[PDB]
Design a protein around this nucleic acid. Structure first.
Lengths: 96, 98, 331, 73, 133
RNA sequence: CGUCAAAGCACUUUGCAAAAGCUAACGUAUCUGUUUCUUGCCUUUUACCAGAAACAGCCGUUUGUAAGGUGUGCUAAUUUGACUGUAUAGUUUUUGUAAUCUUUU
């Protein structure tokens, strides 16, 4: 599915997100998942209060994520057709 | 199924979420979990606004969907002309008779 | 207009472009030959003597051949001029067992800081007049790195030649010691020590790696041997039914060696040539009793003399090379 | 499904977990799960007061987990 | 109409096996080296002639013996390989395919042993020459 | 295999159009002629020898499209396309940690 591949493509860039917790996190993204796990660095948190903090490394659970906010160049990225028997989108030379 | 959902693709949408917040923008990509991707997004928390950009929502977070606006955006046949003329027929009467 | 390039296939594709892409013109291409180089075999019997045009300075230096273990190290980049003198002297002392004062006294490497030639000090009066010699550092190098880029025999590069500054007579002022009065005489010292030391040509050989079936082998050997070939190794290579046949060949005698393999072994047997080595020509290039005939080829030591006359003939130099007396000073 | 998460780089290192109900824990990461159930040893609470109680070996549930941090680089 | 045909594997097998006495046995192409339609064109253009092949009508100071170095005559085979190099004033010429991979398929003579059986022509595979990390 | 859309379907006869778009077998085949030049063997020109360049014919090939023919179905069969095509109540989305109250501006 495409909504997951877009995420994997923003690895490296800086990302903003929102959790069920209520707080938003901002930082460089290192790894993601099909679950919607994340692995980030140099995070700058900002809760409901406005309280800023620093977190060196973080892992997440996707279940806990509400929504992400992604860089602007990631709208020209390709959105593929996928297929019935494939996990990752990718381009497809073969039959279909 | 998901036949209806492809029809919505590339329309400006109004998406209400479980939090109450409402996101707005075009729809680029769609999922089996209802993960939506949205372009040039704007929340309306309520007399309020914010600019985000590209937003990827989960399925858990989404409540309802609603279209705001519509989707954004044999050379030459044989025939030849001529000028005038309008010949007079000597005979009258129909074509087949005589 | 002599032009260079790695080998047959390379040359073909130049002379294709210039003939049909760049210029749209006909040509008369010559039969291809190798680029030669030149070295010293032994030490010089007579020590050198030289005078400046002003006769205020006298330079003399000895030429000796390097060991083959050393020459390769320089061209690889194991030793530089840019390193400290103490690190460089540790190299020679521990590998080739040089003296302690001899090891520190290295001036600069050969033609354009790579070619295997070395300058060195061999005297005591330099310790007495040290600051006097330090005004004559670059005046030697600019007639040495320029003067050994080209050579005596064919106007070509030089390999494995050491230099040993013995006597240095000097004058009061540094106006008597000028650029125009030292450089063109400092260079003449190298050419004089060559002729006394008995020099010889060296030519490039390249590693021919043949592949083949077992039955074709005998033809490869019989072909190689006629063009001076030393098989370094012959094995049935693993995982595939082919025999490797590594080899060496003197570039002059590999003109179309590839096409004769493929013909005679009927489409079996491929071969490549990768630049390697430098092998000395058997005979002596300065021997008056040799001259044979311009039509037929050479065989043994008589071949070395043959290349020299012919190479100089093409350049437009004096053919005999009898004008050794010009560069040998006077005695 | 069941993408076994990338927690190999956290094994046998200290952590600063956060869980549901704003409760958080320190511990050495021993083992992990498909569903992100965790095994922590030398477990110390961080109470809302700040009073730190030593517990020992503990198995935190996957569902609960909000996040997982590293104290030292 | 009888255009287009599709044949089973076993059928094509028999046809092959019946026709065997006619059709060839090269598979490589390397075999041809100086016997390609290209080579023969250059021969024609250079007016030289190669041994087994055809021979046509012709189509169409600096030298100095004392400047040359006579070392191995240079044959006609050499001109028809690298015509731009070894030969001057080369026009109307065609350049040929320099080498192909080489096929390493020997067909099974004795058809009892299986499809995948280490053949005795391949060299053992021993590796005692090597020095690793 | 599954869905949706289009269409009769397979086989065949003619007509009419095309067939280097980024160096490549419309044809893993291959023949005759004209003109202009060069050489052969020659004196009757034709008929020819064997090279070149420039044009032509002929024997064939493919595709699209139009109308037909035979056999079968138009209460069916076949072809052709298109597609974000799978089924999960027990931890990372669709069988809920929800429900409810109160204070501040």
């Amino acid at each position: 599915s495409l909504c997951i591949k877009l995420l994997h493509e923003t690895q490296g860039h800086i990302v903003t997100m929102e959790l069920e917790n209520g707080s938003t996190y901002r930082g460089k993204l290192i790894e993601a998942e099909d679950n919607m796990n994340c692995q980030m660095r140099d995070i700058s948190v900002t809760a409901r209060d406005g309280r800023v903090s620093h977190l060196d490394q973080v892992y997440i659970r996707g279940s806990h994520i509400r929504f992400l906010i992604v860089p602007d160049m990631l709208r020209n990225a390709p959105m593929f057709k996928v297929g019935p028997g494939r996990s990752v989108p990718l381009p497809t030379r073969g039959r279909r | 199924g998901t036949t209806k959902m492809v029809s919505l693709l590339n329309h400006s949408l109004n998406v209400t979420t479980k939090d109450g917040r409402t996101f707005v923008g075009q729809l680029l990509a769609f999922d089996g979990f209802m993960n939506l991707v949205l372009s040039d997004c704007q929340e309306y928390r309520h007399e309020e606004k914010r600019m985000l950009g590209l937003v990827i929502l989960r399925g858990e977070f989404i409540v309802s969907l609603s279209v705001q606006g519509p989707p954004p955006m044999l050379l030459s046949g044989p025939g030849v002309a001529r000028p005038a003329g309008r010949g007079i027929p000597l005979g009258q009467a129909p074509v087949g008779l005589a | 207009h002599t032009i260079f390039g790695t080998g047959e296939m390379y040359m073909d594709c130049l002379l294709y472009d210039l003939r049909t892409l760049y210029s749209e013109i006909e040509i008369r291409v010559s039969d291809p030959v190798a680029r030669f180089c030149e070295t010293a075999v032994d030490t010089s019997s007579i020590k050198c003597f030289s005078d400046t045009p002003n006769k205020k300075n006298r330079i003399t230096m000895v030429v000796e051949p390097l060991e083959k273990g050393i020459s390769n190290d320089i061209e690889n980049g194991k030793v530089n001029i840019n390193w400290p003198q103490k690190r460089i002297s540790e190299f020679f002392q521990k590998n080739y067992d040089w003296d302690l004062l001899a090891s520190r006294s290295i001036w600069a490497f050969g033609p354009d800081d790579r070619g295997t030639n070395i300058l060195r000090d061999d005297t005591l009066s330099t310790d007495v007049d040290k600051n006097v010699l330090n005004s004559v550092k670059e005046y030697i190098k600019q007639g040495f790195q320029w003067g050994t880029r080209e050579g005596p025999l064919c106007d070509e590069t030089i390999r494995n030649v050491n230099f040993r500054l013995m006597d240095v007579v000097l004058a009061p002022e540094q106006i008597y010691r000028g650029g125009g009065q030292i450089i063109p005489t400092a260079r003449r010292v190298c050419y004089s020590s060559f002729l006394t030391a008995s020099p010889r040509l060296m030519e490039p050989v390249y590693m021919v790696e043949v592949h083949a079936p077992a039955d074709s082998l005998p033809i490869i050997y019989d072909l190689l041997t006629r063009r001076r070939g030393h098989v370094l190794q012959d094995i049935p290579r693993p995982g595939s039914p082919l025999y490797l046949v590594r080899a060496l060949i003197p570039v002059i005698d590999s003109c179309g060696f590839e096409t004769d393999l493929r013909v005679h072994t009927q489409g079996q047997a491929m071969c490549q040539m990768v630049f390697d080595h430098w092998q000395v020509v058997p005979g002596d290039p300065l021997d008056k009793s040799i001259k044979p005939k311009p039509l037929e080829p050479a065989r043994g030591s008589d071949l070395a003399r043959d290349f020299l006359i012919k190479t100089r003939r093409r350049k437009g130099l004096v053919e005999d090379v009898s004008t050794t007396r010009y560069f040998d000073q006077e005695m | 499904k069941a993408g076994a998460p990338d927690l190999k780089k956290y094994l046998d290192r200290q952590v600063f977990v956060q869980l549901n109900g704003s409760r958080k824990v320190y511990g050495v990461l021993r083992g992990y799960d498909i569903f992100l159930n965790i095994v922590l040893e030398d477990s110390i609470e961080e109470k809302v007061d700040g009073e730190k109680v030593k517990i020992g070996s503990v198995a935190i549930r996957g569902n609960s987990v909000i996040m997982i941090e590293t104290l030292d680089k | 109409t009888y255009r287009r045909w599709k044949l089973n594997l076993p059928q094509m097998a028999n046809l092959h096996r019946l026709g065997y006495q006619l059709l060839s046995d090269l598979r490589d192409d390397n075999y041809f080296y100086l016997f390609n339609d290209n080579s023969f064109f250059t021969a024609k253009a250079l007016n030289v002639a190669i041994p087994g092949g055809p021979k046509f009508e012709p189509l169409y100071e600096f030298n100095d013996i004392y400047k040359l170095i006579i070392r191995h005559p240079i044959k006609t085979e050499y001109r028809i390989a690298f015509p731009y190099l070894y030969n001057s004033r080369a026009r109307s010429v065609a350049l040929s395919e320099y080498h192909q991979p080489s096929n390493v398929f020997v067909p099974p003579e004795d058809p009892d042993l299986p499809a995948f059986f280490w053949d005795p022509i391949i060299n053992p595979i021993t590796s005692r020459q090597l020095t690793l990390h």
